[PDB]
Design a protein around this ligand. Structure first.
Ligand SMILES: OC[C@H]1O[C@@H](O)[C@H](O)[C@@H](O)[C@@H]1O
Ligand SMILES: [Cl-]
Ligand SMILES: [Cl-]
Ligand code: NA
Ligand code: NA
Ligand code: NA
Ligand code: NA
Ligand code: NA
Length: 324
């Protein structure tokens, strides 16, 4: 009854909660757990999964750093009859993936796009408004979905000249942030401020696909930008970002309750290991390159400073001390 749980890094906040919640809920359900974090190093994650298999893990729950990097080791699991659940991020180009548990990532993107569209009055305004864009790591299939959802809302207005991206970086490849790194985002935003918004130009919005990139952006804006504060989006309700929202430095975030995701994954583990139907609610949205992966999509929730206490504190997700 040993289950392996592979998380990408502790340096991006949520995975600390994902891993802890997985471990707690698996142990409550009667499993033994081998939980490991890979410091966002792909070869480390590969070696950790190899070791889980060697230690006799009967099922693998994997939150991959790079979606297409695990093909060899997952073939080993498949050969041994070990089921694989892709956790939050989809594992790509492998026929070894049994199930996928995540939040509705396209909807996350939609919400971020619609927020900017609403606050900039794009349905009725001539503009132009100045936009910059920061998305996630190109090896994370989720980043494609966050970008795609937001762009499906906003791209028509960029095409129409209502939104202007002064840096010229609009394409996914140009706006992706390696490792979802706060520091990398900060360095790029600093260069964009210095090059394009050091004169009187107002930066009206920054579409950030998550909180770690938003944090880098707001760090740079604090340091170097002298104009009226832009719309800044995000996702995860990281503690640093919630505190920034309380100080007016981030507009909104998206709350994804990792306890709920973990609960759904343990239902899948139980179905596989003890018997039953693994819960799924989508076998149409996520093709991993080998084919459709049966998925369970949890609902993401809009958060801002007017509902964060109800969402995060009254729900028991954070303690009140954490947000001081
Ligand atoms: O950790 C960086 C990002 O990774 C994505 O795959 C997750 O869906 C996000 O919730 C997270 O902010
Ligand atoms: Cl780590
Ligand atoms: Cl750029
Ligand atoms: Na933890
Ligand atoms: Na690393
Ligand atoms: Na509006
Ligand atoms: Na089953
Ligand atoms: Na179902």
């Amino acid at each position: 009854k040993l289950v392996g749980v592979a998380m990408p890094t502790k340096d991006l906040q949520r995975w600390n909660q994902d891993g802890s919640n997985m471990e707690k809920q698996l142990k409550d359900a009667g499993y033994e757990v081998d939980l490991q974090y890979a410091s966002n190093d792909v070869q480390t994650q590969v070696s950790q999964i190899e070791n889980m298999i060697s230690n006799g893990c009967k099922l693998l729950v994997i939150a991959s750093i790079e979606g297409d990097s695990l093909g060899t080791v997952l073939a080993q699991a498949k050969k041994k009859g070990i089921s694989v659940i892709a956790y939050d991020r989809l594992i790509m180009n492998s026929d070894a993936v049994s199930y996928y548990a995540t939040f509705d990532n396209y909807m996350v993107g939609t919400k971020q796009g619609e927020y900017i569209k609403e606050k900039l009055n794009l349905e009725t305004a001539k503009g132009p408004f100045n936009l910059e864009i920061f998305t996630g790591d190109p090896g994370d299939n989720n980043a494609r979905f966050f970008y795609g959802g937001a762009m499906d809302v906003l791209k028509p207005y960029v095409d129409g000249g209502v939104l202007v991206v002064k840096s010229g970086s609009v394409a996914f490849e140009k706006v992706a942030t390696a490792g979802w790194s706060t520091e990398t985002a900060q360095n790029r935003m600093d260069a964009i401020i210095a090059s394009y918004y050091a004169d009187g130009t107002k930066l009206d919005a920054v579409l950030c696909s998550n909180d770690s990139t938003a944090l880098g952006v707001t760090n740079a804006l604090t340091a170097s930008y002298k104009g009226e504060w832009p719309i800044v989006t995000g996702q995860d309700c990281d503690i640093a970002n919630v505190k920034n929202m309380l100080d007016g430095k981030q507009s909104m975030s998206i709350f994804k309750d990792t306890r709920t995701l973990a609960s759904q994954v343990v239902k899948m583990v139980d179905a596989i290991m003890k018997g039953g139907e693994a819960p799924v609610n989508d076998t149409k949205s996520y093709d991993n390159g080998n084919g459709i992966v049966p998925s369970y999509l949890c609902e993401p929730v809009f958060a801002d400073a007017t509902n964060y206490k109800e969402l995060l504190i009254d729900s028991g997700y954070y303690t009140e001390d954490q947000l001081k």
